[PDB]
Structure prediction request, 1130 residues.
Amino acid sequence: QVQLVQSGAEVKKPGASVKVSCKASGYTFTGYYIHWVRQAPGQGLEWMGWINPNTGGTVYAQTFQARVTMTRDTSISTAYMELIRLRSDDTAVYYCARERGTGAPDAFNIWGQGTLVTVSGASTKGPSVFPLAPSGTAALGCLVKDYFPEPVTVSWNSGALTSGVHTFPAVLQSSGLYSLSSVVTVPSSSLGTQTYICNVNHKPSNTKVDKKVEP
Amino acid sequence: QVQLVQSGAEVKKPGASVKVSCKASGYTFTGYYIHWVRQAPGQGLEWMGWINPNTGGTVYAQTFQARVTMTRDTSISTAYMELIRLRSDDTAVYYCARERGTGAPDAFNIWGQGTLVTVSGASTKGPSVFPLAPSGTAALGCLVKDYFPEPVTVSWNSGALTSGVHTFPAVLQSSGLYSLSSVVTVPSSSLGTQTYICNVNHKPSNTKVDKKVEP
Amino acid sequence: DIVMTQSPASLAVSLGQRATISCRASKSVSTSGYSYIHWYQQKPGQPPKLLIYLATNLESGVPARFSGSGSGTDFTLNIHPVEEEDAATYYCQHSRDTPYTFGGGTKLE
Amino acid sequence: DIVMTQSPASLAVSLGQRATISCRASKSVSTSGYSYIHWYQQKPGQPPKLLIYLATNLESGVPARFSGSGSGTDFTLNIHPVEEEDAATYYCQHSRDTPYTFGGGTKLEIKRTVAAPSVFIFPPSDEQLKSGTASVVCLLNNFYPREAKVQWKVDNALQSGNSQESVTEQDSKDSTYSLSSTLTLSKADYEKHKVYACEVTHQGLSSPVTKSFNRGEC
Amino acid sequence: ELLISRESWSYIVEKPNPENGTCYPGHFADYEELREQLSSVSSFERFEIFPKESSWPNHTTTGVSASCSHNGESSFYKNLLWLTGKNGLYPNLSKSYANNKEKEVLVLWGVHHPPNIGDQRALYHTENAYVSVVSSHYSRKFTPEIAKRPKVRDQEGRINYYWTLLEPGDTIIFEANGNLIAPRYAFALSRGFGSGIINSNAPMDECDAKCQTPQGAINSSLPF
Amino acid sequence: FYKNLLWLTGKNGLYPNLSKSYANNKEKEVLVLWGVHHPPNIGDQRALYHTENAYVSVVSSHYSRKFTPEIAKRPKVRDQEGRINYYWTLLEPGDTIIFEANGNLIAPRYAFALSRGFGSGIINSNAPMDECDAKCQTPQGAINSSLPF
Ligand SMILES: *[C@@H]1O[C@H](CO)[C@@H](O[C@@H]2O[C@H](CO)[C@@H](O)[C@H](O)[C@H]2NC(C)=O)[C@H](O)[C@H]1NC(C)=O
Ligand SMILES: *[C@@H]1O[C@H](CO)[C@@H](O)[C@H](O)[C@H]1NC(C)=O
Prediction:
């Protein structure tokens, strides 16, 4: 199978530098150019540049000329993007793309899983997670507060309560942390008799939490 | 051991394209140019071009400029010839050759096993094989009729009758198929008492046949 | 620098109807017998995947519901019949010259 | 474009003698202190293998029976002593300029005593025609030389164009040859004639020899 | 619009500052030497050295720019050809012409120096193209120079224009893997004394004269 | 081949980089000639010089230049499809000229130390000669007469 696979997500301090990797498979690595693209969270794509792995030659966009460095190890058919002097607005998903064909400026058909590079001044502080208890005929919820870095994950009742479950995506607070809410739509009659427990996992902090929720 | 090994034989429809591979071993792949040569069946050699695997640069002959594309993956020390818009007269044995030395236009000393590329409008129709029965003091035979593609193989008495055995090579019929004859020179006295059986194998059709022959 | 304006920013279409995303360039992206637009589909959390290249040529493995049209400076991605699987963000892009610039996006609801 | 004419197209030499294959170029292949000819040996079904490079330099692992000579435009490959292992096709080639052009080939045959073929005919079996097409066969077996010619007769009438033949390569058992000729017909055209014969002209014969059979005679 | 309609004259008339010359910006090599060549041209024959239809079967003719627009539509020079790749290929071309017209043949051509590498990759599908032009004496090689530039006539690239007088019997060969603005028409020149080039903006009537000058004609017996 | 030039070519499969130099110590300006072979095809260059991407560098106190061979098929003048670009320079006294090359050099074998002279010159003509002596000369013939015009 043809494919590109990229180095896992990571964080970096502002002013630091990041190296992303794109390992190719299933095709002659040298014959097809490789571009690097980025997508700011909830924003649109923007194009960084390309490298010709045959020659190692490169082109970069102007807003990335000064700070990006594309390279390739052809022994293992691998490309690298190094971004230095990171600013916060450089937090994004970085993808490695391969052209659909040689020579002609054809399109990108093979893409990478995407590597999430997060840039902010924090120390992978772990989440604090608290109930959002109902009081009558309504749904229920759970809150994740001031945690870093993404991604956290949340579930309910240890992976049984998939019905009416709504995992809102997180928001970035001015505090430099994230927070989100998980919710479950439910009938009210079972509530109070049934016992519901929110649960959450934050691998970067190696931290898992359970939190019961009741009226 | 130094060597080049090439992708197995294959067929292609006219107007289609073929990719032949030459994997090197035992030497620094990048240092020695690689040429591609072809030999039409029962004809003489003709030279296609070369590729410099260090740079990927190429030269091709004029009668092949428009249709040939040489490339190399240096990670696995492998070269490729792609021939497009195949015509029938492009059926041939394609070899990958390595120069005896660097820099100077020295000769070809390492060659490949040769890859047989057959080009014609057929569907690997399997052989029909019929006796060539004697009637007196003479030899005996077996015929293979209107089969495709080469190579078929033939033997006698399940690999025991190697004496006086003559496997004529096949001919290409205007029907777009092949046909050949296997023969055995024998004393006539044992004939009629002894039992002889022609046998044949056509791997592309995964087809084997036995056929007794008697007076 | 060729700017790919893209519209409309969001579509509200129902199953079985036709969705038309109109991309425009600041300058012609057509030459070499080709129009260098490409339309990609990105569903949430995923990378993009190429739908059509060179503004008309459907990519292998793609359904035929997608069609590309237009030339010069004006191009269109037509989906029909719309389906649940088509709820995504649809991006223009040009390979005509550097920098290769996308279109900003078109959510589909 | 430098053209490597090569001659003679075939050699008939006997063991222990000397074989001289003469290659010529349309233009000088000599410069850089080198003559850019190379002589290769290709046996049937095999790739070539390099014998000599730069027109004089024997390659490693090669026997010393092979020698290269000549310069400028005229070059020669000399084999001595010829041996059974040297029965092959011998190609000139130049690296002087592009395109690298070969020479067309020179088959080499072990010369022996002229021997007439053992001739036979095989009528087409009923299975031939149960498939809808019947092919007659005429065999020449273990003959030398190869210049044998075959011509087909049916009902004493000449047959032309409906035929195909193939010869085997020289066999080291005796260095003689065999030829299989075939006359292909439809069951209808088969039926509409009676007696089928093949005639051979060869140096091994006092006079051309024709063999024959009659259709379906017990 | 003089192409189809004029091939002979007595003299050439140019205005002091003509604006409709090189539509696609670039350097016209030996422009002044060409002017001096053409001063002595009494007439010529504008012929399709490389027919657009059959000379370039597998190359996308009909390359066009707005900088050369006509009647509002983007167009291009008429005596030249802007080759471009086709079906994703720009196969090497080797077209040749042998001057058998028994008159020196003025050949024109051009090399596209695009503004960026992506533009070149788009037009010609190679980053490292070249243009080789050869004759019995004339031999030259052009590599495209890629660079952003001031946006003359709204165009950021350039075309370097080149020419040569292929003499009778001589053979001119074009080779290229890209960036060629090939010729579609050339000119077979008929030299002539007395002719010449006059720079002026004066009007014309269908008056006839013995002498002519940029301010006006002279019809008088005097010596001075 | 030319006698005042030299067509270098590789040996034993090598064309080792050369760096020969000459210092004009003859107290007269020295006319140096050389040449660059633009072969018709890449195989020809690879044969003569065993490199695809050769160069020729010629330097002096002022003169500095670099030549890359241009490979291309061409009209077959004098039955030859390649070319040689001929170059020259007047190396002044004390100046040192250096040739560097990994191929394609038609080096000089002889040069010329020039003695300037007034009154001399070049005359284009096909007229015959005898061992007549004259005061003036012209392409059609000499002049031996007292007149001013
Ligand atoms: C030919 O010249 C005309 C002007 O004589 C150009 O047309 C426009 O002319 C106006 C003035 O009348 C200028 O202000 C415009 O800038 C001109 N057009 C452009 C695009 O700048 C015309 O462009 C010229 N075209 C050619 C091919 O020479
Ligand atoms: C042009 O390309 C077509 C594509 O099929 C091919 O058949 C033809 O031979 C080519 N002709 C030339 C002159 O390249």
Observations:
- The pocket of ligand 1 is lined by residues E 19-20, 23, 68, 153 (CB under 6 Å).
